[PDB]
Design an enzyme around this catalytic site. Structure first.
Site, PDB file in Angstrom:
ATOM      1  CG  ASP A  67      -2.050   1.089   1.022  1.00 30.47           C
ATOM      2  OD1 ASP A  67      -2.812   1.083   0.022  1.00 30.47           O
ATOM      3  OD2 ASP A  67      -2.089   1.982   1.883  1.00 30.47           O
ATOM      4  N   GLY A  94     -11.046  -3.590 -13.158  1.00 30.12           N
ATOM      5  CA  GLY A  94     -11.331  -4.717 -14.038  1.00 30.12           C
ATOM      6  C   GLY A  94     -10.208  -5.060 -14.999  1.00 30.12           C
ATOM      7  N   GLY A  95     -10.489  -4.922 -16.290  1.00 29.24           N
ATOM      8  CA  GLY A  95      -9.570  -5.436 -17.317  1.00 29.24           C
ATOM      9  C   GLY A  95      -9.847  -6.897 -17.623  1.00 29.24           C
ATOM     10  CD1 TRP A  96      -8.243 -11.516 -20.829  1.00 31.92           C
ATOM     11  CD2 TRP A  96     -10.225 -10.858 -21.662  1.00 31.92           C
ATOM     12  NE1 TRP A  96      -8.855 -12.621 -21.390  1.00 31.92           N
ATOM     13  CE2 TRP A  96     -10.067 -12.239 -21.913  1.00 31.92           C
ATOM     14  CE3 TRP A  96     -11.393 -10.217 -22.102  1.00 31.92           C
ATOM     15  CZ2 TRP A  96     -11.041 -12.992 -22.580  1.00 31.92           C
ATOM     16  CZ3 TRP A  96     -12.361 -10.964 -22.761  1.00 31.92           C
ATOM     17  CH2 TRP A  96     -12.178 -12.342 -22.993  1.00 31.92           C
ATOM     18  CE1 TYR A  97      -4.503 -13.461 -14.590  1.00 29.47           C
ATOM     19  CE2 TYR A  97      -5.024 -11.900 -12.838  1.00 29.47           C
ATOM     20  CZ  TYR A  97      -4.532 -13.118 -13.251  1.00 29.47           C
ATOM     21  OH  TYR A  97      -4.067 -13.995 -12.295  1.00 29.47           O
ATOM     22  CD  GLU A 143     -11.668  -5.925 -21.152  1.00 31.32           C
ATOM     23  OE1 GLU A 143     -11.231  -6.821 -21.889  1.00 31.32           O
ATOM     24  OE2 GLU A 143     -11.000  -4.925 -20.851  1.00 31.32           O
ATOM     25  CG  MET A 211     -11.616  -1.507 -24.977  1.00 30.82           C
ATOM     26  SD  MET A 211     -11.480  -2.795 -23.739  1.00 30.82           S
ATOM     27  CE  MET A 211     -13.193  -3.244 -23.601  1.00 30.82           C
ATOM     28  CE1 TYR A 213      -7.895  -2.153 -27.015  1.00 33.95           C
ATOM     29  CE2 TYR A 213      -7.927   0.132 -27.742  1.00 33.95           C
ATOM     30  CZ  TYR A 213      -7.990  -0.803 -26.732  1.00 33.95           C
ATOM     31  OH  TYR A 213      -8.142  -0.396 -25.432  1.00 33.95           O
ATOM     32  CG  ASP A 214      -7.080  -6.459 -28.654  1.00 34.61           C
ATOM     33  OD1 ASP A 214      -5.949  -6.293 -29.158  1.00 34.61           O
ATOM     34  OD2 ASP A 214      -7.312  -6.362 -27.430  1.00 34.61           O
TER      35      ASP A 214
END
Length: 498
Positions: A67, A94-97, A143, A211, A213-214
């Site tokens: 921290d 979040g995010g994909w992972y 996601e 997003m 892209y991808d």
């Protein structure tokens, strides 16, 4: 003439936070000190990434995070505000992972939004984290919520919005109010999860950051551009999943909105958003990648485009063959399938066997390695001219990119985006947007201005006849029709009167 948003991700993994240093690129490749005052002035938002939702169903840092070190890193980012009184340091949850359907924390996303009490506890935790660490707004990157979880997600966003608005008042922050954004799907398959409720999703947001892209990758059989602006008829096409979304529209309405198959492009995603009533162009932000996607085992004939390939799709990358010749960062990251723009420039410059080629339909560059059969799809300052002109023409909110560490050392990609929007001496009035395929769909939210003879009672109208009536232009679906437009199913609303 509102300033266009320029939203850049700053991604730093837990191990780099825990060992944070600004003097050893082998430990932290992209420390905060690489974001110079000049770069800080060119950004409107930095999305610090990623925080998560924990099993207590609250926004939280990875529990392995030190921290004190986390606060030090964030404080270095918020200090940048000294250079730019418009700059916000957002944080992304979040995010994909963390949040993908099979991600480590996925159930926490589903459960945090599931009930009114869960939504209150979650929303409060987002604002508490924002205030505790000194962030300027909340960005949620789930996601992606599935159709059934969407109403909970909407209510969670609504509740966060109310709490942020309270905080703006409490802090006298009307000059730079706390903001709420999401990273949205930039392709129709994931977008279809929540598309029918898009207006409700966007209403509480300052921006929805697409997003875009991808859109190509090792999971597809055929190589392609991952962020084509417009379509190439020689390239692959895709089923339009939006036509199966629960919209309650008629066959003609669905068909006009959702041509299928279609070209999976940036323009397609943007237009798909604009077709929905209540989704304002000014809230739509176009994502662009600061990295390319590399494929091996490609054939010649068309510079490696639209070829079969032998690129593993597994995670993690399944062996130690780092076959992207010249990609030093790929060795560091043990994955030859993604290369920063920073590295791609060096690959072009060195004796590595790449050609830079340009597709004038998609308006995007690509590398081709003829000797080994490699193809790389990426974006650069040239593709960003067309995308920036599109952003201005379509009155979008701005641009978002992943990620800051992938621009070159001089920050040329960010400087280009800033130039195209803000430089007094930059002129793109003659920039030719080409003859690439446009997404031709029209929906309730983007009817074109039209004119036509006034509708006349008693007149027998053939199929395809156009009339004006009660503020709109209408077309008969079949003939012969005599009903008043809008009174039955025979007339399609096709345009609006100026």
């Amino acid at each position: 003439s509102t300033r266009k948003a320029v939203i850049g991700y700053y991604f730093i993994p837990t191990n780099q936070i825990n060992n944070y240093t600004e003097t050893d690129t082998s430990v932290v490749p992209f420390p905060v000190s690489n974001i110079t005052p000049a770069k800080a002035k060119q950004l409107t938002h930095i999305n610090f990434s990623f925080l998560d939702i924990n099993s207590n169903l609250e926004c939280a840092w990875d529990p392995a995070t030190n921290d004190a070190k986390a606060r030090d890193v964030v404080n270095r980012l918020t200090a940048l505000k000294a250079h730019n009184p418009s700059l916000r340091i957002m944080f992304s949850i979040g995010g994909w992972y963390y949040s993908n359907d099979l991600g480590v924390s996925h159930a926490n996303y589903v459960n945090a939004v599931k009930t009114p009490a869960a939504r209150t506890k979650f929303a409060q935790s987002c604002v508490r984290i924002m205030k505790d660490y000194g962030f300027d707004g909340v960005d949620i990157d789930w996601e992606y919520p599935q159709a059934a979880e969407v109403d909970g997600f909407i209510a969670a966003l609504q509740e966060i919005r109310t709490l942020l608005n309270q905080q703006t008042i409490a802090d006298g922050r009307q000059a730079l109010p706390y903001q709420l954004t999401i990273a949205g799907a930039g392709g129709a398959f994931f977008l279809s999860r929540y598309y029918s409720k898009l207006a409700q999703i966007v209403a509480p947001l300052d921006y929805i950051n697409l997003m875009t892209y991808d859109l190509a990758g090792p999971w597809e059989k055929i190589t392609n551009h991952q962020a084509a602006l417009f379509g190439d008829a020689a390239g692959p096409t895709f089923y339009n999943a939006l036509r199966e979304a629960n919209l309650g529209w008629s066959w003609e309405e669905l068909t006009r909105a959702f041509p299928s198959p279609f070209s999976l492009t940036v323009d397609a995603a943007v237009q798909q958003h604009l077709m929905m009533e209540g989704v304002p162009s000014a809230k739509i932000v176009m994502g662009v990648p600061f990295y390319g996607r590399a494929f091996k085992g490609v054939s010649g004939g068309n510079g490696g485009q639209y070829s079969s390939h032998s690129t593993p799709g597994e995670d993690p990358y399944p062996n130690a063959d780092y076959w992207l010749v010249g990609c030093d960062e790929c060795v560091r990251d043990k994955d030859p399938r993604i290369a920063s723009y920073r590295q791609l420039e060096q690959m072009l410059q060195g004796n590595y066997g790449y050609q830079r080629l340009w597709n004038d339909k998609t308006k995007t560059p690509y590398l081709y390695h003829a000797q080994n059969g490699l193809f790389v799809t990426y974006d650069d300052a040239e593709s960003f001219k067309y995308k920036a002109k599109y952003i201005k023409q379509q009155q979008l909110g701005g641009v978002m990119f992943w990620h800051l560490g992938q621009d070159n050392r001089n920050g040329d990609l960010l400087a280009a985006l800033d130039r195209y929007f803000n430089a007094a001496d930059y002129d793109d009035s003659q920039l030719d947007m080409g003859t690439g395929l446009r997404y031709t769909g029209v929906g309730p939210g983007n009817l074109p201005i039209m004119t036509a003879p006034a509708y006349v009672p008693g007149t027998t109208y053939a199929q395809g006849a156009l009339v004006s009536y009660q503020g709109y232009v209408w077309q008969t679906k079949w003939g012969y029709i005599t009903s008043a437009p809008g009174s039955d199913s025979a007339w399609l609303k096709v345009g609006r009167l100026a």
